[PDB]
């Protein structure tokens, strides 16, 4: 799903059992292979030390 | 001429142009209000967006 | 950079309750996720990116 | 780079599987390409250069050695030595070289 | 001072003012602060965003182009049109914006190298180089032994070895009100010919040559050019270039996936 | 608007777009112990961020032929982190809960629930001579369930789980005198109650006295046409408030 | 008088009839974190009675041919009740200890001890290539001991426990530059130190960083005539002060 | 001025205030002055403790590391991670304290040496060296003829022979509030792996190379690096290292007696 | 700017940072009262320690 627009769609379907995991990824906004090419990533990849908090809007 | 640093420091301009002065390095001003919230009606935080 | 002394945790997302739907409606839905910084972000110690390479001039 | 134990003594019985581990972590100042070697002093026995394996170097040990993990770029250089025999006594050197760091591990195997 | 905002304390509330739920359709990014979804302590924050400004991000020299020219040869001399499209470590820092406006500070790091001479007892004195700058439209030299070099009123600099590298400053030389790092649209009213080419950013050429003569053995030199955008102001930011550059004129590329991949969505 | 709420505690948050108002106990808001009423001879401890947050119990499935569920309150959080850990090393302790149950459905289902929190719920055994044992009276954050059939008599230590008597020998209809809310899949989506500390002594042990009980009884059973989702789960998330303990000791 | 003290914390008390003065760190008294220095983005928790009390470690015997003992400080209390329990569920945390060591003898024995609390004590391995493993570097409220003989070389992951080098490669005499007190069985009976939080970051994890070390080195060895008691035990009781934590998570 | 205290006169007393006898158990060092155990004359004292302060004890340059790299070879270039653990005349001055905080002043003393060339009439011009500094995380070059050198925005310095040695200043670059010259405790939450290793003091690498080409005969160079801790503040003093260092990572050692010995206790 | 030496001497700051100024060399202040006497109750010299 990388060489397409499917990389941004998170699969959510009507499960049968309760308490399943949808996704999960470590939070290293300059080294992880998920938050790397986002707009935050190519700003962090020019500096070395960062700080502050991060928001994560879902839709 | 004399200003503060990251105490004081002294700077003197020698040449008679403007593109010869050193870098500024001290234009600390930001205003994200034109990239974050570029909407017509003001959006309050607490009340819902609709 | 990928280090171990300063890890920053993990992010997960679990089903609280199932995804229910009426009839004649697809059960396969999708979700998008954004990312940004709060108003107390900052950086330091400028360097160059490890992404763009070059062997000869263009 | 840093190996957890630069040298130790291992003892196994003839006809068993020999575990010669080689763990490491990565300091922040390491950003080059990965390289992992393995030596023997009774001569390379297996290489890992360019994310691909080249491991037909020692005629005495053909297929009798192969990496364990599937995440070799995470700090695993261990080898699975199978079917130990008597001509396999010698000191091993797990030489890993990631620019600009270097680290070794001296595994003296005795049987 | 450009200090960041501190965080204010909070108490466990139970009210109808929900700061978490919003509508991302409106193109309006969220504005919540952690003090609105959990209990926080009043932390004075002294961090500063100074080293992330524009003039701290761009005003750093970067090699652009470098050419070689032998001494013992006819027309041994280097020419170069002035453009930042050629090196990629600097090209990408200038594509983050669309309309830039800066004055420049060149710097040349000239070196020499003795060639495989053939005579005996070779010995040459110090060398002297000339770096001539031709505006767009001036007359261009054809060979080293030419009379467009001396008898000229263009800005040039004379430099000899063993000293500090030369350096001149160039003001904002353009026809519009900003350099355009992008220009969609043709350059002929009939909409033919080359696609992304603009006269707005042309700056002329650079001709360099030796000043000494051929004593006994050739000497190949080398000159490296360094930019330094000062007084810079940027407009209309832009996402960063992802696919690898292929040409210096256009923005051609080959398609490549968005990111490197992982084994499963939950790992 | 008037349909959305946003409850926060400690370092957790609960947000609901569609819900009704919140019912607050018997009119009092849970707070600490005043010193006119205190009886312990020493000073109590107050974590106040390590315990006051939203723990989430296990899930339950709402089948068509469902009967009910109940949780014994200061027993279900026995294994939830710092609350269960402070509940062991101490000897006394008072709390006040903010119960929240949530069950969402589409606009094509039908049903209703009664979310009641009966205080001092004493239950009766199946055999008239015995009394229900501990294993079958409660479970660690697990839901024991009622039934629609009268439990037989040959059972030795079991609970009488006939739902039309709520297990307490009382008529199931009259349960609304306790604080309660109706989960109605037509207009409602979530029910939330704020229960103070209700007991006849200022503090008490917490391994021997389950001084609350959260029951859920489906009056109008779930029903749907063919095609809609056949699995509708219920999830309750409980959060202590204004907790404090006394009398350190060994583990137990 | 001027010989007696009476220290109390939480719900425990320490009383000593014969003792010397109390040495207070580097001149500062342990307190909470001011908000000019705070770095965590959330609010910390403060038990303040559940942790701030005197835990008592295991005992050690002072034989005639003794060498020494050391305890790694924010690791020895890993199993002592609520302190060890809050040390697991959180991620950060700062403390300040009030160490107290006590060894009593009659008027017919002789000996002396050096009660030192070296901060950031990094120890060296027996083999010059390796580093000491965790099992042999510290123990849960148990005393690892020095030796009088140089540890051999064929050992793979062990600690060099030659006492005349204090294990850190430093001369054992110069250790008095750190806060310390002498247990002298002539006039002294108990030594007590009050150590603040000494570290280069305002808070830190507590399973990966033992930012103190309490050592005990007998300079003048124990000696007695025949007839007196041949068994003289030492006991150290440590008590956190002004503790607070951050960043809840699962158990680990 | 930092003057020492003078001494005041005394008279032969006979009283119950004994200043000599005290109790060393209390960990409280004595505080007597010779004017309390004998008769002294009022001596004005002008001595000054200025040349024993911290900034007079540390702010003196000391060689740290030096590498060599030949000209006529592939990938002839020197790399070095920045750490003070390697030289022992400076390592010991920094172990006297636990938490230091200083900004730095590097200095490079670059020299050359002509190698055994083989051709006839060898003659090379002046040389030019580049000393590139890569922050922790940046891209590292692989060979001399590489495009990570020029097209870069890292801080580098260009220097040519026969001039004053280069020098740059580096501010306090760390994640905490002080460099830690000691760190007891592992670096993985599982308590495995290397023992005394900390990210707090990392400073990057240093890549150096020639800028000229191979004229006729190889030239091996040599660069020496010098620190200079300024604005320094020290915390939590520490006894001085006795046993000889053996490694650059940990503090391993071999046990050695406290002092050199004498023939008898009374000599 | 102008201060005394070990007469007077003049110093001028040129660069616009703080890590570029020369060494201080003139922070003469000491306080051994936290290493010599780190005890809770004050200890007088003359009277005995017990």
From Swiss-Prot, chain D:
Q: In which tissues is it expressed?
A: Expressed in pancreas, brain, heart, small intestine, testis, prostate and at a lower level in liver and lung. Isoform 5 is ubiquitously expressed. Isoform 3 is expressed in heart, lung and pancreas. In skeletal muscle, isoform 1 is found at the neuromuscular junction and isoform 2 is found in blood vessels. In cardiac muscle, isoform 1 and isoform 2 are found at intercalated disks. In heart expressed in subendothelial layers of the vessel wall but not in the luminal endothelial surface. Expression is elevated in hearts with dilated cardiomyopathy.
Q: Which UniProt keywords apply?
A: Cell adhesion, Cell junction, Cell membrane, Disulfide bond, Glycoprotein, Host cell receptor for virus entry, Host-virus interaction, Immunoglobulin domain, Lipoprotein, Membrane, Palmitate, Phosphoprotein, Receptor, Repeat, Secreted, Signal, Tight junction, Transmembrane, Transmembrane helix
Q: Which GO terms describe its cellular component?
A: acrosomal vesicle; adherens junction; apicolateral plasma membrane; basolateral plasma membrane; bicellular tight junction; cell body; cell junction; cell-cell junction
S-S pairs: 22-94
Q: Where do glycans attach?
A: 80
Q: Which residues form the Ig-like C2-type domain?
A: 1-108
An example GO BP is: defense response to virus
Q: Which GO terms describe its molecular function?
A: beta-catenin binding; cell adhesion molecule binding; cell adhesive protein binding involved in AV node cell-bundle of His cell communication; connexin binding; identical protein binding; integrin binding; PDZ domain binding; signaling receptor binding
What PTMs does it carry?
A: N-glycosylated.
Function, please?
Answer: Component of the epithelial apical junction complex that may function as a homophilic cell adhesion molecule and is essential for tight junction integrity. Also involved in transepithelial migration of leukocytes through adhesive interactions with JAML a transmembrane protein of the plasma membrane of leukocytes. The interaction between both receptors also mediates the activation of gamma-delta T-cells, a subpopulation of T-cells residing in epithelia and involved in tissue homeostasis and repair.
- Self-association or partners: how does it assemble? Monomer. May form homodimer. Interacts with LNX, MAGI1, DLG4, PRKCABP, TJP1 and CTNNB1. Interacts with MPDZ; recruits MPDZ to intercellular contact sites. Interacts with JAML (homodimeric form). Secreted isoform 3, isoform 4 and isoform 5 can interact with the extracellular domain of the receptor.
* Domain writeup: The Ig-like C2-type 1 domain mediates homodimerization and interaction with JAML. The PDZ-binding motif mediates interaction with MPDZ and MAGI1.
Q: What is the protein's given name?
A: Coxsackievirus and adenovirus receptor
In its UniProt entry, the species of origin is given as: Homo sapiens (Human)
Q: Which residues of the full protein are shown?
A: 20 to 137 of 365
């Amino acid at each position: 799903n990388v060489s397409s627009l499917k990389a941004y769609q998170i699969p959510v379907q009507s499960n049968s059992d309760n308490g399943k995991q949808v996704f999960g990824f470590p939070l290293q906004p300059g080294a992880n292979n998920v938050l790397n090419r986002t707009l935050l990533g190519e700003i962090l990849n020019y500096y070395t030390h960062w700080s502050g908090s991060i928001k994560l809007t879902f839709m | 001429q004399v200003s503060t640093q990251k105490i004081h420091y002294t700077n003197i301009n020698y040449y008679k142009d403007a593109a010869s002065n050193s870098a500024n390095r001290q234009d600390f001003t930001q205003d994200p209000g034109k990239f974050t919230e570029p909407v017509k009606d003001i959006m309050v935080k607490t009340m819902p967006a609709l | 950079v990928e280090d171990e002394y300063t890890a920053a945790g993990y992010v997960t997302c679990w089903y609280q309750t199932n995804i229910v739907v009426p009839a004649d409606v697809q059960s396969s839905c999708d979700i998008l996720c954004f990312v940004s910084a709060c108003n107390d972000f900052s950086v330091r110690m400028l360097k160059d990116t490890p992404f763009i390479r070059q062997d000869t001039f263009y | 780079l840093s190996i957890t134990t630069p040298e130790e003594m291992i003892e196994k019985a003839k006809g068993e599987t020999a575990y010669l581990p080689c763990k490491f972590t990565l300091s922040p100042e390491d950003q080059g390409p990965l390289d992992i070697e393995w030596l023997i002093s009774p001569q390379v026995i297996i290489l890992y250069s360019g994310d691909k394996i080249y491991d037909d170097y020692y005629p005495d040990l053909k297929g009798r050695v192969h990496f364990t993990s599937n995440d070799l770029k995470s700090g695993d250089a261990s080898i699975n030595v199978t079917n130990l025999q008597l001509s396999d006594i010698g000191t091993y050197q797990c030489k890993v070289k990631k620019a600009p760091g270097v680290a070794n591990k001296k595994i003296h195997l005795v049987v | 001072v450009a200090r960041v905002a501190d965080t204010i304390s909070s108490r466990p509330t139970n009210s109808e003012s929900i700061p978490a739920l919003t509508a991302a359709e409106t193109g309006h990014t969220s504005q919540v602060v952690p003090s609105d979804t959990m209990q926080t302590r009043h932390v004075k924050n002294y961090h500063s965003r100074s080293e992330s400004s524009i003039e701290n991000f761009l005003c750093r020299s970067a090699c652009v182009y470098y050419a070689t020219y032998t001494n013992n040869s006819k027309k041994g001399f280097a020419e170069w049109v002035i453009n930042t499209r050629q090196v990629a470590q600097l090209r990408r820092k200038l594509e983050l914006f669309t309309y830039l406006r800066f004055d420049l500070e060149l710097t040349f790091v000239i070196t020499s190298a003795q060639q495989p001479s053939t005579a005996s007892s070779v010995d040459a004195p110090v060398q002297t180089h000339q770096i001539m700058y031709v505006p767009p439209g001036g007359p261009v030299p054809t060979k080293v032994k030419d009379y467009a070099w001396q008898t000229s009123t263009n800005p040039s600099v004379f430099w000899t070895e063993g000293n500090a590298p030369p350096r001149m400053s160039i003001p904002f030389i353009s026809i519009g009100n900003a350099y355009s790092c992008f220009y969609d649209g043709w350059t002929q009213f009939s909409r033919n010919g080359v696609y992304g080419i603009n006269t707005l950013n042309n700056m002329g050429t650079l001709y360099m040559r030796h000043v000494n003569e051929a004593g006994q053995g050739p000497i190949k030199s080398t000159v490296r050019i360094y930019f330094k955008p000062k007084h810079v102001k940027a407009w209309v930011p832009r996402p960063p270039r992802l696919c690898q550059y292929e040409k210096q004129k256009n923005v051609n590329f080959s398609p490549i996936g968005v990111t490197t991949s992982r084994t499963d969505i939950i790992t | 608007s008037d349909r959305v709420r946003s409850i926060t505690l400690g370092n957790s948050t609960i947000t609901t777009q569609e819900c009704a108002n919140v019912v607050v106990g018997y009119g009092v808001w849970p707070e600490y112990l005043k010193d006119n009423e205190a009886t312990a001879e020493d000073q109590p401890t107050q974590p106040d961020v390590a315990t006051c947050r939203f723990y989430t119990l296990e899930s339950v499935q709402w089948m068509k032929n469902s009967a009910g569920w109940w949780w014994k309150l200061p027993d279900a959080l026995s294994q939830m982190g710092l609350f269960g850990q402070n509940m062991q090393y101490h000897y006394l302790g008072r709390t006040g809960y903010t119960i929240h149950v949530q069950c969402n459905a589409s606009k094509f289902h039908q049903g209703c629930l009664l979310v009641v929190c009966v205080p001092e719920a004493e239950m009766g055994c199946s055999n008239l001579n015995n009394t229900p044992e501990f294993s079958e009276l409660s479970g660690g954050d697990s839901a024991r369930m009622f039934t629609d059939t009268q439990v037989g008599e040959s059972n030795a230590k079991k609970v009488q789980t006939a739902v039309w008597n709520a297990g307490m020998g009382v008529g199931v209809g009259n349960l609304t005198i306790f604080p309660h809310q109706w989960i109605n899949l037509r207009t409602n989506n979530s029910a939330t109650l704020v229960m103070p500390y209700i007991n006849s002594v200022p503090m008490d042990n917490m391994f021997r006295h389950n001084n609350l009980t959260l029951m859920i009884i489906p009056f109008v059973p779930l029903n749907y046409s063919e095609g809609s989702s056949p699995y509708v789960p219920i999830t309750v998330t409980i959060a202590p408030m204004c907790a404090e303990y006394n009398g350190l000791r060994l583990a137990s």
